[PDB]
Amino acid sequence: AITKPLLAATLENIEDVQFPCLATPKIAGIRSVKQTQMLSRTFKPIRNSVMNRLLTELLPEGSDGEISIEGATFQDTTSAVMTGHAKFSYYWFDYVTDDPLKKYIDRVEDMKNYITVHPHILEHAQVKIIPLIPVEINNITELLQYERDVLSKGFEGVMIRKPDGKYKFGRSTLKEGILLKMKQFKDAEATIISMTALFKSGKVEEDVMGSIEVDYDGVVFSIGTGFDADQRRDFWQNKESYIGKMVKFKYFEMPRFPVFIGIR
Numbered sequence: 001a002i003t004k005p006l007l008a009a010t011l012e013n014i015e016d017v018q019f020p021c022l023a024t025p026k027i028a029g030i031r032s033v034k035q036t037q038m039l040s041r042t043f044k045p046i047r048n049s050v051m052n053r054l055l056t057e058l059l060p061e062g063s064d065g066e067i068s069i070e071g072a073t074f075q076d077t078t079s080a081v082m083t084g085h086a087k088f089s090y091y092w093f094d095y096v097t098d099d100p101l102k103k104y105i106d107r108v109e110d111m112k113n114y115i116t117v118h119p120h121i122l123e124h125a126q127v128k129i130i131p132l133i134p135v136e137i138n139n140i141t142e143l144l145q146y147e148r149d150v151l152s153k154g155f156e157g158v159m160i161r162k163p164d165g166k167y168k169f170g171r172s173t174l175k176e177g178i179l180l181k182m183k184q185f186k187d188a189e190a191t192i193i194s195m196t197a198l199f200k201s202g203k204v205e206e207d208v209m210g211s212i213e214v215d216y217d218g219v220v221f222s223i224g225t226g227f228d229a230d231q232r233r234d235f236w237q238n239k240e241s242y243i244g245k246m247v248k249f250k251y252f253e254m255p256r257f258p259v260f261i262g263i264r
Contacts (some may be wrong), residue, residue, distance in 0.1 A: 002033055002062065002096055004072050005041055008179040009185065011087035011160060014140055018177050022104065022134035022163055023146055025155035026181060031080040033057040038067075040082075047084040054127050055090055060114055065093035065132070070205055086126075093132035093159075104178075107167065108133060126194035139160035148257035152225040153252055157183035184249035185259070190214035192247060195239050196222065198232060208232035211240070212242075214247065216255065223249055226260030 011017065031041040038046040038055045045050040051067065065168035069077045069088045080086065095111040102110075111131060115121065118184070120214055137143050137160075147158050150170075158181075165178035172178035191214060198210035209232045227235070231257050242263070251258040 002035055002100070002167070003169040004043060004063070005031060005033060005064065006094070006168050008159065008181040009172045009174045011174070011180045011182040012071070014143060014182070014184055016174060016179045017140070018162060019136050019138060021165070022141070022161045024093055024132045024134050024159045025150045025153065026159050026183070026250060027066040027068060028074050029066035029077055029091070030150055030157050032065060032067050032090070034061055034063035036061070036245050047082050050085060051081060051088065053246055055080060055114060058121050058129060062096035062098075063092055064096070065090055065092040071120065078093065087128065089127070089128035089130055091130045091132050092168065096167050096231070100169070103160050104165040105163040116125070140189070144183070144252050144257060145183065147182065148252070148259055151185060151259045151261070157181065157185070184236060184252060185257070186245040186253050187248065187250055188216065188255070189246050190216035191203060192242050192245050194243070195235065197236065206233070206241045207236060209235040212247070212260070218263060221255060221258065223247070
């Protein structure tokens with residue numbers, strides 16, 4: 001049973017991380033727990049009845065996760081989930097089952113096994129159930145590479161958990177290291193100067209952008225991650241249009257691991 005969701009403490013100093021740790025991507029979405037029906041973080045039922053019903057039928061009691069409409073904006077997702085009414089996803093990152101004191105790695109194994117018994121749940125038409133199985137990170141270099149990866153996939157940053165952590169009915173402290181949020185990359189802007197192609201209906205011949213070279217206050221470097229296929233094609237088909245455009249990107253200050261965020 002769950003009395004209130006598990007919340008995270010903020011990781012400010014990366015050197016504070018107890019290393020053998022389990023990481024997942026920081027999702028920008030609607031926190032939802034399965035307890036009789038789908039509940040939000042305030043533990044009031046999910047306003048969108050179809051989402052509520054669908055997920056309650058699909059998920060086992062004690063499920064914890066995030067609802068989100070894949071390529072939509074946060075404000076779109078918010079109104080779809082939070083309005084008392086399209087395809088959507090549910091990143092399932094925790095499963096209590098019974099005993100909240102059961103270690104985090106173990107609850108994850110419960111989720112994994114449940115899926116093994118019920119594979120078809122990953123096959124729903126409208127609802128995409130995405131099991132958020134953690135990555136074992138061993139050092140700081142691995143943590144930062146992970147944030148770069150995660151940011152390149154469009155996530156906010158990273159969520160850190162100790163393997164033996166319990167499901168706390170409240171916010172974790174930094175010392176507990178049960179659940180921590182990390183956004184170690186810095187936001188910066190750069191002007192686009194040139195582009196480099198990727199492959200050196202029937203439109204399959206056409207090439208797309210592989211990387212963009214940017215200025216960033218005198219220091220030139222390329223950004224080859226952070227864009228989806230759509231972006232790579234658009235940037236390349238109309239490259240003459242983005243030259244001189246300012247792009248938002250992230251990187252780790254001592255640029256290392258640069259990642260494209262957006263235009264303007």
